[PDB]
From Swiss-Prot, chain B:
Signal peptide boundaries: none
Name of protein: Adenosylmethionine-8-amino-7-oxononanoate aminotransferase
Family matches, as InterPro entries: Aminotrans_3 (IPR005814), Aminotrans_3_PPA_site (IPR049704), BioA (IPR005815), PyrdxlP-dep_Trfase (IPR015424), PyrdxlP-dep_Trfase_major (IPR015421), PyrdxlP-dep_Trfase_small (IPR015422)
GO molecular function: adenosylmethionine-8-amino-7-oxononanoate transaminase activity; protein homodimerization activity; pyridoxal phosphate binding
Organism field: Escherichia coli (strain K12)
Additional record remark: Catalysis proceeds by a classical ping-pong bi-bi reaction mechanism.
Co-factor(s): pyridoxal 5'-phosphate
Catalytic activity as recorded in UniProt: (8S)-8-amino-7-oxononanoate + S-adenosyl-L-methionine = S-adenosyl-4-methylsulfanyl-2-oxobutanoate + (7R,8S)-7,8-diammoniononanoate
Expression induction or repression: Repressed by BirA.
NCBIfam families tied to this protein: bioA, PRK05964.1, PRK07986.1
Length: 427, 428
């Protein structure tokens, strides 16, 4: 990449949630291997982010690579309308088998946000078929479910700046963010949620939440009793429960799916990010026979969704290979060990002036700060320390690949601790 | 693939818009090469669909394969937050250069529907930054823009069964489907509906959104380019943004590189997908102007509020770059031109078949509209038996073959379409 290439990127290429009028530096990556990113200048960076949760097996993984190359040899893509193929069948077999018993109907899609849209549409079509006027979603504050309009409608109104779209977005119900920490349970936590359920139980199509960990909305970690209660309340009212595990799925919190922490099964389950081992985009929305059949037995005669690249063979083959790595079970002790190291090595941030809170769960470590980070200055600091840590707002957090070496993890936690010692990298 | 595999698929795997309780047969594909799909049992089928527009270079294309494997060796994926990479830069360079001058800012995304959502959000954020209360979209009937909530809100309400979501989806403005044909003459009467809507709602419209020249999923309709010219000028005069959804028409399918070229206009926002990657995997792009991109970033949010996890995926960008590189030769122009003449000539006889209502052809798109709905299971079986993969829908038997299709292969497709419509055997 020439200097001109970098200049072109700056002035012509949009990046996630960042200014085009005051663009901040971006770092040119040429390749990646193991748990490292390689910059164009040759510098190697230990990846603390897993490219946002997804790359649970690191980069240039020989098994993932071989499975992708082999599927390219057969066919990278063929349409899914009137056609099926081995990669999709093998993936759906794995997803059905590894998720709770009732979850046995799979709708593959292209991205997490679309998987949520699909889940929301399922709930709406389900009640339409049952002849019930139910179009409200009940969710938690500080939630994040994606960027498309339907998904946006259940994201935190404050965090997601709903004022920007006031009048275009359907108005859903927002219960208080769960207070009880992943910590003791306080029954008073439930009041707000109960109030909404009582006033709107006739109207609610589904409850949608991120189980245990609220990711993009604040990296919050709450008590599993909440899920137990939400499942019971949904059962009692006959309301559908959507669990968005696009960030928590596939081992990240220490259990295969975060719903396990409460031993509950949702009616609809959304999966993404780490589904493919972070090689390329793919998502899946699973639901029950009751939901899927009911929908097909309504006026539309089918579930009304079907993206062009639905069931893409290449992505399915990558997901199959990623799941085959998880099948070994090594991730269990890998995450447990990561959790121990995160707890131990982030503990000192609790003596730092710029820290508001420290919390760890599985392969997730979060240092919440008192003031917003200086994105440009802090990003450069991390790069100079030989690490790729991507903070945002008042969060400096780590979600490394499960295969990260202890010495690599140590470089990450050491950098985080150093960054929070004084105000240098803040505001 | 075993029969047990096929039973599992039927019982547990949803497919695009089709019943789970009364599913029709799906055919098991094991591989594909050139212009052929290879079924589990060994049967080879000439692909007439390009896997829904996308596979313009066919299957197992050497250049696409080589580029994809080479990128895998470097990195299949890395996040785009605070990071950039060569595949993304090369792709965006190509996209900026090949599209109209004002379209110089690129937002890469995951799918066509997401690209439309991005376009709609850009329009909404643009006006919010300018302090104007504009939240409505003016679109056309028979339009199709995707299946996510925002996209659904501008899709044809009858075709898409908006009654299912009545009260949840926002209610946009729907001008009548364009009547004047791409084959035929312009009729100024075509404008009254649109003119009446713009006049009544000019002050609240954030954007006009349309598929240029060809309305795909909504009816395989082919309309007169004067429409785009007229719309562009109206948008210009009114200060309203124009969104051209070229997810199906982009990259040469209608005979021009982008269907907007037929009218020699440029939209404010351009959506691309399907053939972007040569149909190897999903990727999309939404291009806009500097005016739009800067205005949004200067508003309250300080940025355009979107950013999907897999944004800028190196592997898909590498595939797209290789696909665009093939198009750079310009060979597609002649290929598409030749396909167009053969489609016109070989579908023409169908106009005399009793089951046929209309025959229309544009670029590498050939449509035979019938008088009655097709019998999906029976007709699909028939096509497979003729050694062709043609996927009909409703009253439409259409072809959109890969540009590399051989004349003999194209003839097998047209022969099959003609034979399918000779009597009512496969209808209703
Ligand atoms: Na299951
Ligand atoms: Na351009």
């Amino acid at each position: 990449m020439t200097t001109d290439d970098l200049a072109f990127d700056q002035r012509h290429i949009l990046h996630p949630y960042t200014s085009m009028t005051s663009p901040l530096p971006v770092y040119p990556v040429v390749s990646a291997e193991g748990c490292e990113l390689i910059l164009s200048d040759g510098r190697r960076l230990v990846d603390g982010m897993s490219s946002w949760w997804a790359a649970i097996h690191g980069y240039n993984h020989p098994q993932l690579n071989a499975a992708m190359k082999s599927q390219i040899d057969a066919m990278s893509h063929v349409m899914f309308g009137g056609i099926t193929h081995a990669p999709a069948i093998e993936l759906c077999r794995k997803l059905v088998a590894m998720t709770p018993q009732p979850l046995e109907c799979v709708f593959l899609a292209d991205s997490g946000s679309v998987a949520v849209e699909v889940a929301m549409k399922m709930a709406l079509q389900y009640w339409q078929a049952k002849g019930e006027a139910r179009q409200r979603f009940l969710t938690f504050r500080n939630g994040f479910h994606g960027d498309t309009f339907g998904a946006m409608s259940v994201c935190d109104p404050d965090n997601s700046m709903h004022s920007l779209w006031k009048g275009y977005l359907p108005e859903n119900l927002f219960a208080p963010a769960p207070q009880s920490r992943m910590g003791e349970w306080d029954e008073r936590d439930m009041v707000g949620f109960a109030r909404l359920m009582a006033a709107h139980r006739h109207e609610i199509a589904a409850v949608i939440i991120e189980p245990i960990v609220q990711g993009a909305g604040g990296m919050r970690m709450y008590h599993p009793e909440w899920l137990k209660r939400i499942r019971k309340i949904c059962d009692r009212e006959g309301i559908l429960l959507i669990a968005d595990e696009i960030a928590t799925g596939f081992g990240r919190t220490g259990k295969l799916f975060a719903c396990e922490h409460a031993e509950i099964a949702p009616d609809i389950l959304c999966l993404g990010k780490a589904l493919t081992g972070g090689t390329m985009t793919l998502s899946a929305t699973l639901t029950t026979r009751e939901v899927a059949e009911t929908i097909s037995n309504g006026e539309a005669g089918c579930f009304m969704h079907g993206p062009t690249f639905m069931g893409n063979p290449l992505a399915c083959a990558a997901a199959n290979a990623s799941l085959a790595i998880l099948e070994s079970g090594d991730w269990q002790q890998q995450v447990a060990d990561i959790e121990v190291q995160l707890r131990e090595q982030l503990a000192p941030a609790r003596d730092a002036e710029m820290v508001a809170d420290v919390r760890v769960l599985g392969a997730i470590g979060v240092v919440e700060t008192t003031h917003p980070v200086n994105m440009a200055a802090l990003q450069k600091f991390f790069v100079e320390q030989g690490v790729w840590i991507r903070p945002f707002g008042k969060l400096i957090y780590l979600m490394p690949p499960y295969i990260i070496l202890p010495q690599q993890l140590q470089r990450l936690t050491a950098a985080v601790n150093r960054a929070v010692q004084d105000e240098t990298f803040f505001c």
